[PDB]
Write a protein that binds this ligand. Structure first.
Ligand SMILES: COc1ccc2c(c1)C(c1ccc(Cl)cc1)=N[C@@H](CC(=O)N1CCC(N(C)C)CC1)c1nnc(C)n1-2
Length: 110
């Protein structure tokens, strides 16, 4: 619905807000494989995703429903878990931001 997509825009605003910056910063823009020295990133990760891409899709009304929005946000986190070992600090940062996302997404009115 239009109303659920409105709640999703509020979730995205929360994920981009200053209170989460200490763990959100790796996710604001696409992974820059050249800058980071990740020569195999685009071989391993076939469908990159990040918050700037989710924001553009929300602004252009490209999500048909709330579930399509959730699939892109979960894809962003899944790519991080897929690429990195489980002991890495970026994985701990992803799980902190994901817990914000999953809590707010669960509270969406029907
Ligand atoms: C703008 O900076 C970014 C953007 C995307 C990143 C990363 C950093 C940060 C990053 C690293 C440390 C901290 Cl504390 C935070 C983030 N990691 C990269 C991954 C990275 O560089 N690795 C891969 C693992 C290697 N092991 C030695 C095995 C080291 C190099 C990354 N992956 N998903 C996202 C999103 N990312």
């Amino acid at each position: 619905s239009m109303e659920q997509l409105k709640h999703c825009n509020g979730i995205l605003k929360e994920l981009l807000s200053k209170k989460h910056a200490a763990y959100a910063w790796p996710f604001y823009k696409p992974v820059d494989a050249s800058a980071l020295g990740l020569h195999d990133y685009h071989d391993i990760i076939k469908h990159p995703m990040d918050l700037s891409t989710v924001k553009r899709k929300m602004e252009n009304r490209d999500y048909r429903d709330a579930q399509e929005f959730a699939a892109d946000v979960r894809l962003m986190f899944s790519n991080c878990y897929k690429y990195n070992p489980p002991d890495h600090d970026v994985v701990a940062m992803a799980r902190k931001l994901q817990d914000v996302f999953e809590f707010r997404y669960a509270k969406m009115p029907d």
